[PDB]
Design an enzyme around this catalytic site. Structure first.
Site, PDB file in Angstrom:
ATOM      1  N   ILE A  10       0.781  -1.240   0.000  1.00 14.73           N
ATOM      2  CA  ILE A  10       0.000   0.000   0.000  1.00 14.73           C
ATOM      3  C   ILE A  10       0.816   1.295   0.000  1.00 14.73           C
ATOM      4  O   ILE A  10       0.267   2.374  -0.215  1.00 14.73           O
ATOM      5  CB  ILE A  10      -1.047   0.033   1.143  1.00 14.73           C
ATOM      6  CG1 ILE A  10      -0.413  -0.388   2.472  1.00 14.73           C
ATOM      7  CG2 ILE A  10      -2.250  -0.839   0.785  1.00 14.73           C
ATOM      8  CD1 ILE A  10      -1.299  -0.175   3.674  1.00 14.73           C
ATOM      9  N   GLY A  11       2.120   1.187   0.233  1.00 13.03           N
ATOM     10  CA  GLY A  11       2.992   2.361   0.235  1.00 13.03           C
ATOM     11  C   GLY A  11       4.173   2.262   1.180  1.00 13.03           C
ATOM     12  O   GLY A  11       4.618   1.165   1.522  1.00 13.03           O
ATOM     13  N   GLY A  71       6.389   3.881   4.763  1.00 14.40           N
ATOM     14  CA  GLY A  71       6.475   4.665   5.982  1.00 14.40           C
ATOM     15  C   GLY A  71       7.942   4.888   6.264  1.00 14.40           C
ATOM     16  O   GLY A  71       8.799   4.571   5.433  1.00 14.40           O
ATOM     17  N   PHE A  73      11.487   4.139   7.420  1.00  9.56           N
ATOM     18  CA  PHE A  73      12.250   2.885   7.411  1.00  9.56           C
ATOM     19  C   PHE A  73      11.409   1.638   7.097  1.00  9.56           C
ATOM     20  O   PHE A  73      11.378   0.699   7.894  1.00  9.56           O
ATOM     21  CB  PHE A  73      12.991   2.662   8.742  1.00  9.56           C
ATOM     22  CG  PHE A  73      13.614   3.900   9.327  1.00  9.56           C
ATOM     23  CD1 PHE A  73      13.195   4.375  10.570  1.00  9.56           C
ATOM     24  CD2 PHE A  73      14.632   4.577   8.655  1.00  9.56           C
ATOM     25  CE1 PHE A  73      13.767   5.512  11.133  1.00  9.56           C
ATOM     26  CE2 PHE A  73      15.213   5.720   9.209  1.00  9.56           C
ATOM     27  CZ  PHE A  73      14.780   6.187  10.455  1.00  9.56           C
ATOM     28  N   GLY A  74      10.726   1.622   5.955  1.00 13.89           N
ATOM     29  CA  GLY A  74      10.028   0.407   5.532  1.00 13.89           C
ATOM     30  C   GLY A  74       8.847   0.555   4.593  1.00 13.89           C
ATOM     31  O   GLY A  74       8.383   1.664   4.325  1.00 13.89           O
ATOM     32  N   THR A  75       8.368  -0.583   4.096  1.00 13.60           N
ATOM     33  CA  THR A  75       7.221  -0.640   3.194  1.00 13.60           C
ATOM     34  C   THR A  75       5.984  -1.107   3.955  1.00 13.60           C
ATOM     35  O   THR A  75       6.053  -2.038   4.761  1.00 13.60           O
ATOM     36  CB  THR A  75       7.492  -1.589   2.002  1.00 13.60           C
ATOM     37  OG1 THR A  75       8.634  -1.125   1.271  1.00 13.60           O
ATOM     38  CG2 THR A  75       6.301  -1.652   1.064  1.00 13.60           C
ATOM     39  N   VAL A  76       4.857  -0.456   3.689  1.00 13.64           N
ATOM     40  CA  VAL A  76       3.598  -0.779   4.357  1.00 13.64           C
ATOM     41  C   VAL A  76       2.748  -1.730   3.512  1.00 13.64           C
ATOM     42  O   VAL A  76       2.698  -1.619   2.286  1.00 13.64           O
ATOM     43  CB  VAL A  76       2.789   0.495   4.699  1.00 13.64           C
ATOM     44  CG1 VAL A  76       1.673   0.166   5.665  1.00 13.64           C
ATOM     45  CG2 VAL A  76       3.693   1.563   5.303  1.00 13.64           C
ATOM     46  N   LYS A 112       4.164  -2.767   8.516  1.00 11.68           N
ATOM     47  CA  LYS A 112       5.331  -2.056   7.998  1.00 11.68           C
ATOM     48  C   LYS A 112       6.548  -2.961   8.090  1.00 11.68           C
ATOM     49  O   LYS A 112       6.888  -3.450   9.165  1.00 11.68           O
ATOM     50  CB  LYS A 112       5.574  -0.749   8.748  1.00 11.68           C
ATOM     51  CG  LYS A 112       6.640   0.129   8.114  1.00 11.68           C
ATOM     52  CD  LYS A 112       6.786   1.446   8.839  1.00 11.68           C
ATOM     53  CE  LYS A 112       7.592   1.303  10.118  1.00 11.68           C
ATOM     54  NZ  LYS A 112       7.708   2.613  10.810  1.00 11.68           N
ATOM     55  N   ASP A 150       7.674  14.003  13.359  1.00 13.65           N
ATOM     56  CA  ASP A 150       7.266  13.852  11.967  1.00 13.65           C
ATOM     57  C   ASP A 150       5.761  13.989  11.785  1.00 13.65           C
ATOM     58  O   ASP A 150       5.197  13.458  10.827  1.00 13.65           O
ATOM     59  CB  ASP A 150       7.753  12.511  11.409  1.00 13.65           C
ATOM     60  CG  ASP A 150       7.719  12.455   9.882  1.00 13.65           C
ATOM     61  OD1 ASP A 150       7.741  13.526   9.233  1.00 13.65           O
ATOM     62  OD2 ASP A 150       7.671  11.332   9.331  1.00 13.65           O
TER      63      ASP A 150
HETATM   64  C1  LIG Z   1      -1.423   4.887   0.935  1.00 12.40           C
HETATM   65  C2  LIG Z   1      -0.283   4.989   1.966  1.00 12.40           C
HETATM   66  O1  LIG Z   1      -0.796   4.757   3.278  1.00 12.40           O
HETATM   67  C3  LIG Z   1      -0.074   4.108   4.228  1.00 12.40           C
HETATM   68  O2  LIG Z   1       1.121   4.353   4.429  1.00 12.40           O
HETATM   69  C4  LIG Z   1      -0.868   3.534   5.278  1.00 12.40           C
HETATM   70  S1  LIG Z   1      -2.492   3.001   4.868  1.00 12.40           S
HETATM   71  C5  LIG Z   1      -2.746   2.488   6.525  1.00 12.40           C
HETATM   72  C6  LIG Z   1      -3.920   1.900   7.048  1.00 12.40           C
HETATM   73  N1  LIG Z   1      -4.003   1.543   8.350  1.00 12.40           N
HETATM   74  C7  LIG Z   1      -2.940   1.758   9.156  1.00 12.40           C
HETATM   75  C8  LIG Z   1      -1.729   2.340   8.709  1.00 12.40           C
HETATM   76  C9  LIG Z   1      -1.637   2.713   7.350  1.00 12.40           C
HETATM   77  C10 LIG Z   1      -0.512   3.327   6.647  1.00 12.40           C
HETATM   78  N2  LIG Z   1       0.721   3.666   7.227  1.00 12.40           N
HETATM   79  C11 LIG Z   1       1.494   3.207   8.218  1.00 12.40           C
HETATM   80  C12 LIG Z   1       2.450   4.096   8.758  1.00 12.40           C
HETATM   81  C13 LIG Z   1       3.307   3.688   9.802  1.00 12.40           C
HETATM   82  C14 LIG Z   1       3.175   2.374  10.284  1.00 12.40           C
HETATM   83  C15 LIG Z   1       2.227   1.499   9.750  1.00 12.40           C
HETATM   84  C16 LIG Z   1       1.369   1.887   8.706  1.00 12.40           C
HETATM   85  C17 LIG Z   1       2.249   0.154  10.405  1.00 12.40           C
HETATM   86  C18 LIG Z   1       3.344   0.367  11.492  1.00 12.40           C
HETATM   87  C19 LIG Z   1       3.951   1.778  11.345  1.00 12.40           C
HETATM   88  N3  LIG Z   1       4.889   2.321  12.008  1.00 12.40           N
HETATM   89  O3  LIG Z   1       4.406   2.783  13.278  1.00 12.40           O
END
Ligand SMILES: CCOC(=O)c1sc2cnccc2c1Nc1ccc2c(c1)=CCC=2NO
Length: 262
Positions: free
Chosen positions: A16-17, A19, A21-24, A36, A129
């Site tokens: 989905i994208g 964050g 330090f990593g891919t979500v 993530k 952030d």
């Molecule tokens: C389209 C891009 O969106 C994203 O980045 C999304 S959609 C979404 C939905 N539900 C929860 C989180 C997210 C999310 N981002 C994130 C951002 C940080 C996160 C994460 C998810 C899991 C652990 C962590 N670090 O603490």
């Protein structure tokens, strides 16, 4: 008690994208979760550290408005599991799909974001952030502050001047977090990203640093309360000590809330 999840438990699905330090990804682990992940073959002590740091931070948070930390995994790859938020981030709502939120709702989004930060600062957690990208809207009606990769115990528009001109050693404080919140208040009340009329980033950086450019507050929509405009100017103070802390901020938003529907 402990929060590690054994290998093979986390079903990783859709990407989905990204964050910090990593891919979500959207995953499954006793229901829908967000995952993530590092997805690096072998982690650097550099990466290993930022991972252990974030987990350490998240596990100190338990709040409605803070994105629920659920567990972590070091086993197939480094990964953090949190609850799922169906319905997108505040940035997406505002600047991508262009949701036209009603004012009463906008203030409530601002009231919850304030609520969450107060909590974090009460626990001595600086987010470092805060941006609308990190403010998630669960089922369209509940704010979940997420992404604690940079938190302590790249995106410049939310950065306080002090932070922008890198000096001294640590510019990040409760006050710098307040500034960031000030910009999300701007996004809420204006439906626009700041400095939208300037197309040069290194100009925006330079200019905010030397204090020649501040957010154009006369752009708030006409039905935005005078009290709300006042608080926004208070947060966006160039001098950091002239900013309020969240306990005082929250109070103000709750006071302007009660005298609104009438
Ligand atoms: C389209 C891009 O969106 C994203 O980045 C999304 S959609 C979404 C939905 N539900 C929860 C989180 C997210 C999310 N981002 C994130 C951002 C940080 C996160 C994460 C998810 C899991 C652990 C962590 N670090 O603490």
């Amino acid at each position: 008690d402990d929060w590690e999840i054994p290998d093979g438990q986390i079903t990783v699905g859709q990407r989905i994208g990204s964050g910090s330090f990593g891919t979500v990804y959207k995953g499954k682990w006793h229901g829908d979760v967000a995952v993530k992940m590092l997805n690096v073959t072998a982690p650097t002590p550099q990466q290993l550290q930022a991972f252990k740091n974030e987990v350490g931070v998240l596990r100190k948070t338990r709040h409605v408005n803070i994105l629920l930390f659920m567990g972590y995994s070091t086993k197939p790859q480094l990964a953090i599991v949190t609850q799922w938020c169906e319905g997108s981030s505040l940035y997406h709502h505002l600047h991508i799909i262009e949701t036209k939120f009603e004012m009463i709702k906008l203030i409530d989004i601002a009231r919850q974001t304030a609520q969450g930060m107060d909590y974090l600062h009460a626990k001595s957690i600086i987010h470092r952030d805060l941006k609308s990208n990190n403010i998630f809207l669960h089922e369209d009606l509940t704010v979940k502050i997420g992404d604690f990769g940079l938190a302590t115990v790249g995106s410049i528009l939310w950065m306080a001047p002090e932070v922008i001109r890198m000096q001294d050693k640590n510019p990040y404080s409760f006050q710098s977090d307040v500034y960031a919140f000030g910009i999300v208040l701007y996004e809420l009340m204006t439906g626009q990203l700041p400095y939208s009329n300037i197309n040069n980033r290194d100009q925006i950086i330079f200019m905010v640093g030397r204090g020649y450019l501040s957010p154009d507050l006369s752009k708030v929509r006409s039905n935005c309360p005078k009290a709300m405009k006042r608080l926004m100017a208070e947060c966006l103070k160039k001098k950091r000590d002239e900013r309020p802390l969240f306990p005082q901020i929250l109070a103000s938003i709750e006071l302007l809330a009660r005298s609104l529907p009438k």
